Paper text:
The screening of crystallization conditions produced two crystal forms, prismatic crystals of a primitive orthorhombic form (Dps-o) and primitive cubic lattice crystals (Dps-c). The Dps-c structure is nearly identical to the Dps-o structure, as indicated by the 0.38 Å RMSD deviation observed on superposing the Cα atoms in the dodecamers (1832 residues). Superposition of the Dps-c and Dps-c-Fe structures or Dps-o- and Dps-o-Fe shows that only small rearrangements of D64 and E68 side chains are required to bind the iron ions in the ferroxidase centers of Pa Dps.
The protein, termed Pa Dps, adopts the Dps subunit fold and oligomerizes into a nearly spherical 12-mer quaternary structure at pH 6.0 or in the presence of divalent cations at neutral pH and above. The 12-Mer Pa Dps contains two di-iron centers at the interface of each subunit dimer, coordinated by conserved His, Glu, and Asp residues. In vitro, the di-iron centers catalyze the oxidation of Fe2+ utilizing H2O2 (not O2) as an oxidant, suggesting Pa Dps functions to aid P. aeruginosa to survive H2O2-mediated oxidative stress. The Pa Dps structure harbors a novel network of Tyr residues at the interface of each subunit dimer between the two di-iron centers, which captures radicals generated during Fe2+ oxidation at the ferroxidase centers and forms di-tyrosine linkages, thus effectively trapping the radicals within the Dps shell.
Numbering used by the authors:
A (entry chain C), B (entry chain A), C (entry chain E), D (entry chain D), E (entry chain L), F (entry chain B), ...: 1 to 155
Amino acid sequence: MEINIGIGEQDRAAIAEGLSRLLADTYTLYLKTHNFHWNVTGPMFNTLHLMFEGQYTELAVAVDDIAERIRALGFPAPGTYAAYARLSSIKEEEGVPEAEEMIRQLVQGQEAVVRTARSIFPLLDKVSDEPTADLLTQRMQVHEKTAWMLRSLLA
Amino acid sequence: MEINIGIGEQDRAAIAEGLSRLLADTYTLYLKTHNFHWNVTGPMFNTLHLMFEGQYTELAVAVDDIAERIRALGFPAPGTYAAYARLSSIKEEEGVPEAEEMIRQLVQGQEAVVRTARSIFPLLDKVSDEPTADLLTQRMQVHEKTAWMLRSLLA
Amino acid sequence: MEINIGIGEQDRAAIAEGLSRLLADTYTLYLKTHNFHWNVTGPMFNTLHLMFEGQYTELAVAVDDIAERIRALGFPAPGTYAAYARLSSIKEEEGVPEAEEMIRQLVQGQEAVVRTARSIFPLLDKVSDEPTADLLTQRMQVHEKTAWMLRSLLA
Amino acid sequence: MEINIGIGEQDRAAIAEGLSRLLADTYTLYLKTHNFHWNVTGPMFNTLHLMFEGQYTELAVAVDDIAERIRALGFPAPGTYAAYARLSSIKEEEGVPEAEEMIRQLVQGQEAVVRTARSIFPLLDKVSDEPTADLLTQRMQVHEKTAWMLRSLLA
Amino acid sequence: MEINIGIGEQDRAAIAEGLSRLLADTYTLYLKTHNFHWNVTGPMFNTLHLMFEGQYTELAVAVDDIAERIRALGFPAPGTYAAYARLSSIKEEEGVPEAEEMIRQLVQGQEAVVRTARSIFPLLDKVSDEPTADLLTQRMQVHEKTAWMLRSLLA
Amino acid sequence: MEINIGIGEQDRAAIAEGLSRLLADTYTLYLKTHNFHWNVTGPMFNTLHLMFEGQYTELAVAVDDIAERIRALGFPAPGTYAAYARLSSIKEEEGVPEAEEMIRQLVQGQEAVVRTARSIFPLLDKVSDEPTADLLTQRMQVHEKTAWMLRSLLA
Amino acid sequence: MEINIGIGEQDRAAIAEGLSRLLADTYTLYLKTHNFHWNVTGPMFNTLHLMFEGQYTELAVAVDDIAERIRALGFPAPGTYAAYARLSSIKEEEGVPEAEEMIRQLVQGQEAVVRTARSIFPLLDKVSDEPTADLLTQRMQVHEKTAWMLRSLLA
Amino acid sequence: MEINIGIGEQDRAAIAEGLSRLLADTYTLYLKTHNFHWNVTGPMFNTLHLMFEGQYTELAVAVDDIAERIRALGFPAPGTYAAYARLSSIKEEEGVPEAEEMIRQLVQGQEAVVRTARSIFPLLDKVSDEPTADLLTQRMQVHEKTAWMLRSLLA
Amino acid sequence: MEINIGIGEQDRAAIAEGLSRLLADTYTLYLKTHNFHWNVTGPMFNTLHLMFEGQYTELAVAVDDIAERIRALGFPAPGTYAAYARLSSIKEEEGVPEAEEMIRQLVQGQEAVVRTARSIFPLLDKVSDEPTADLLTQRMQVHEKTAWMLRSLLA
Amino acid sequence: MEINIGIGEQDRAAIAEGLSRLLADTYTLYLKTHNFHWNVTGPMFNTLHLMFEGQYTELAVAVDDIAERIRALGFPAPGTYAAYARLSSIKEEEGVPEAEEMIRQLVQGQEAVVRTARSIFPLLDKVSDEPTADLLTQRMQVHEKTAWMLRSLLA
Amino acid sequence: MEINIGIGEQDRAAIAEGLSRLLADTYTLYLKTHNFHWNVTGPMFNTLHLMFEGQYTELAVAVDDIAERIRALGFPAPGTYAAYARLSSIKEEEGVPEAEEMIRQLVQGQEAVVRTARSIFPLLDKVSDEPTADLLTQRMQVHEKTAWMLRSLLA
Amino acid sequence: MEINIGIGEQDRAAIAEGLSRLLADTYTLYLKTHNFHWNVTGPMFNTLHLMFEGQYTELAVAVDDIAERIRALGFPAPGTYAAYARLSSIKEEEGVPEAEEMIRQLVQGQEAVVRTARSIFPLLDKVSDEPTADLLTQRMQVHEKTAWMLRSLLA
């Protein structure tokens, strides 16, 4: 069946490309936070184990919201290590850093996701894709809130 | 008591007219989804019975949200067979189609509501009615997602 | 697959014809109660807004219960504006009446549906259909309770 | 301690005999549906595994209800293989049918239970035992609804 | 506002009279059960304390269901020590019986309400009050089940 | 087994006598409030029906708490229409008054229970019984709050 | 840590300034609604006590959402009587008005917050801060709906 | 599809054979427990009625666990009166024992299922089937706990 | 309607005057704790953010309990910035102090509320008001527990 | 940080010393009840196993409430076998008594805790500590209710 | 702090190496199950979307249980694309297979993970690590159940 | 009644002796953790107060599982300060250690319970008591997981 939601094929494919990067960054942050949750140590273990659990639990939902938006625009949602590594703008971390470096990286992750989100809006201004704009707007709100809480731990 | 929400009377009347149409399309789709939930048969009875239940349940909430916005703008919400049939752009189905054709009509229902939502946006760009704009955007998001799920059944 | 529930096909069609009138009446009362919920104003707004919401919530379920009984007898459940307008004995209200008149029209609604339920018990006395009789009895119980609560407001 | 619930020893013993058969048929249908739940296969596995789960879960509650009604009349509830075999009018399936055949057997089982229920009403239209009559009506309504949904799968 | 439910004044008044006696018996049983809940002692304290709690908590809900049927019929529901003492057929226990005598009196209290409900049916066999008939049926069901669990303890 | 809770037997019998009068007054208000819930009419039906429901639901818990203190003191809790009529200081309403009169009677009822509770403190100053004193205090708190809400309706 | 969320310091500070005024108006409406909840009397006590409870409960959540947006932007959230009095545009009520005047002031309060939200959009017109714009939009949605329900009581 | 879980076809069938005797004993215990729940009488009625309910409720879930493991092993789960009467080692009981006898038989029932579970372990010590060994362990745990509770009643 | 709860008008006005200061202190501590929740930073952000949330959430319930006690005494509850600034003994914090200093101030706030509560008991000793005494006792219990938890952080 | 709750240090130490003895008696009673829970046998096993579970579950919360008041008073709460053996006035049972003797010991233990609580009131009359007095009063209420329930079993 | 759990460091690092491959396999099957949930199409969309959702949601919890057993053994848990790509015996799928092939790959996945788990039992035999043994037994049980449900769709 | 569960008297008594040691260490760790919950102070008060609460809460369910295993084996469960002091290997702490020392001591406690569990495996692998073996395995999993979380704070 045809897709007649008021956005053309070329435009939907361009939007699904931007959301593919958003999905990649969000998944990479998800896995990193999940990593730090398991591996953080030190006097802040109890509070960071719990904080990081709240964050990756939220990001597991966020990846679903973004993948389902791509599917609604008529495109397959990427979902492999290789696809995400190619699309992610987020530097992975292969070691076990100190808790304060874990905080600092999670802050930069949040702001990396915000950067990818903002990069997509210019595309949307020419088109009218109002649902996608609102998904970006919600992801931005969540990540900027999480950044304040994470960096507060460092002031 | 006068209404001072930052939008004048003529303009609030025009937005309510547009949302009256949205309300009529959403109600007409609700009743058709409800109709197909009762009447669908075949090997996909169970899966479509359940699927259309989730959709008409969602749409019953949506008709309240659209009608409450009309009231917040200062106008009565339409609510009769005669008013919805006059205002609706959705084609009614008086018979009992095959399951696949039920699916196909409900895809075009989703897209018909999105088209009605898109037609109201020029009016909000000339004024500023940000709450109504967000309402339209949430409806488009729901309908576009439901359209992907429905037509995936037809691949 | 044939139907062997101890009621013949033309006898089940007769029961379904009456249930289709009960359904059309129940669904017209649903949408009118829903209408009045949105549209009532005045000093009784809070209490009536809430009272009508409880009623139309109950009636969205009753609509399903009646429709599924039609399907259990082996006939399609009607589900369109034209079908309900044809089969309904409840006259719609196309405008916005004062709250006391809304109350009055809904009392008479309740008593209308009780009449239609009662119009079916002759048929069931000839044809033994004890589940359908229980359904009619439950609808009468609810509509009579509701008429008491409604008319208590006018005493 | 004596029993004075308005129904004499002889009649309670009769109604109890009917319910003993209703119980045996409901329990036989219970185990058959449970069987088919575990054992069904093919591309409708997800649907039928779930549908038959809901039915056997309901039927577990039904056997309790029926057994307690027998205890209220003042007689023991049958509850052994030998007693259910002898009292049952539903034949069990000792092998593993194909999915469509499982459906057909379950439809027929619903109808067998409905038949056993009617067989009890005459015993009641002579006496006055309105609680037992309501129990049969409820069982009849559940099994006829289930019959519709099961047979809808074979259209 | 006139009451138009298909029963009409003097019939409704007779049924209300019947239901008033059922309410008085039910409230009288509710209080006696409450009383025995507080006051029972001996090695069966815990199980009877809890069992009579289940019963009076149920009866508290039943007095509401009965009262509201009197009101849907259009008559005031009785609610004083004098109205109930006049209308009730249960003998009140002003002292503190042994546990086995409490059980025995509660059994007879159940059969007292069934007996009062049976008294009322003939008058429905004339009028076609199906909701009231269904209320009487549910109360007979509960008291008959409760009689079995109570007298089981004496065996 | 003997009772050794720091209060002699005739002193516990005097406290229990005072609490029996409190139970009788609270039960009488329970049933009067319950009566008025069923029977109130007028434009305040919905709000008084609901307000009186909250009150009798709370009072049903109160009668259990008071009865159980009598039992903890080693004396039986009264629980018959005759004992409560002998013990209570509140008068029942045998008719159906207007809603404003219903409100006024319930105000005076709360204030009557407060007085009965006050009347027991001189005893408790002679006899140390801190749990009972806290029970009286809690009932005084509830009835004074409830008096405020009721009498606000009359301002 | 630096804050890199795609908005510069001086724009973040100007936006936090506007949100501080929104927070002040929202907290002042919170306390006013809370006050009226406690203090309202007359025949509408029950429905207005409840309605204002719903509003102040919602506003308590809203002040957290607004304050946390100011924090996410990197500035302190104001939280004292003096700071809110300085920034607020709502006129406080030091007495206890009649119920209808309470409703009227709460309508004007809703319209006051909406007005303050609007005054911030031209500054998000220069810098792109979509999360803040969606917050304002949600607050406008809530207050325009609440104004409808409040005004309706005065019709 | 090939079943490739590291157990050979003949070994799985011998495991399934063992599990099938377990299922038969559990199901026979389930129905005997259910039966005794319905039929026990005397002073211990409430405590045993409830005790056996918790037991049969647990057993209803165990039969599902056993059956699903047989299917995980690639074999049909048995599900008839005949297949269970043949595989079960549990003396069925066709009358109504005194409560002490009922408790005794249920104790032997527990130990019988334990004996059957132990009889499968030699087979398990020659084949790597750790999940099946875990299922036997959990069943042995439940039945030995239940044995203690039931025989404590006879101390 | 006249208030007859056993306390004269001027004696109630004096109790209400003391509870009005307790309310202003409790409310000022509410806003300060809320303020500190939003604005605290450093390595104890997560733990203090959460702890202060639990506190301001509790205090919001407390201000309702105190304000309802004033209404039960027959006087209006204060509820403005100017009333609370006038009646409060707790000074507000207009800046953003260090985490340690926030903790210290909240310890001192708890202790200030205990002194205001304590200050009211001499009036209650002259005027019997046991409910108010219980209210003050409960606030003292909570603030003393909270003070332990806060000052433990500084050991 | 200093403690200023209006009680001097040696006076708090005296209250804490009383509460430490209450804690030790509550904990000793907790473990004894827990032990009897596990070990009781005979025809009352089901009812006493459950009753004792209710009791030890309540006492576990009590030991927390008592310990936290000691901490609010500024002193360490005891918690070792040696500390409780020293401070406790309740003797432990090293064996396994007959059920009737378990009930007796638990009655005695309830009354033992009441006595320990009573004994702290002279101190509280000389130094004002209203929270602790309330705690003692609640403990006395709970243990007096429990002693009624327990000793009713021995009548 | 040193680790003294009865398992030397050499043996712990070897169990950790095994558990890391299990984690990498469990994670890869997690993301692949997640990927197919978003991307499956055709007439089995509803049933598979849901069935896969249930699978990856379970798998998300399994990766936590596994990573945390690694931590309890005292080693870091891998958590990056490179580490899982390196350790994973599960084969990536970079495109969009037909529904039947998705089912096929997921059966393979379940079996691969059972393979990795079985591979580790030698170490736990040599050692005694009963907690890790129980984790592998639980994963094998889950994945063998899932393979049954998946492959049943293809029968 | 005899005990026949596949293990002889002498063998079970030996298992009950080792589980008595396990119950004593587990109860001793429970009280010690509970003590440290009340008594810990310093900047980690909040996280340790909460972490120790989750642990003592878990252990309270453990001692029930161990005591009931002993009962199922046919032996009385030990339950006194002297019994546990005799059988326990945990060193009791009579002081109030600094927070870091409390953590260290609870680590050692976890490891101590593991030791007692391991010591039981040689027995029972001479018998075949798999329920007991699985009980030991569950406790080892919890204590080893908890030991990781505790020692992470000391890193």
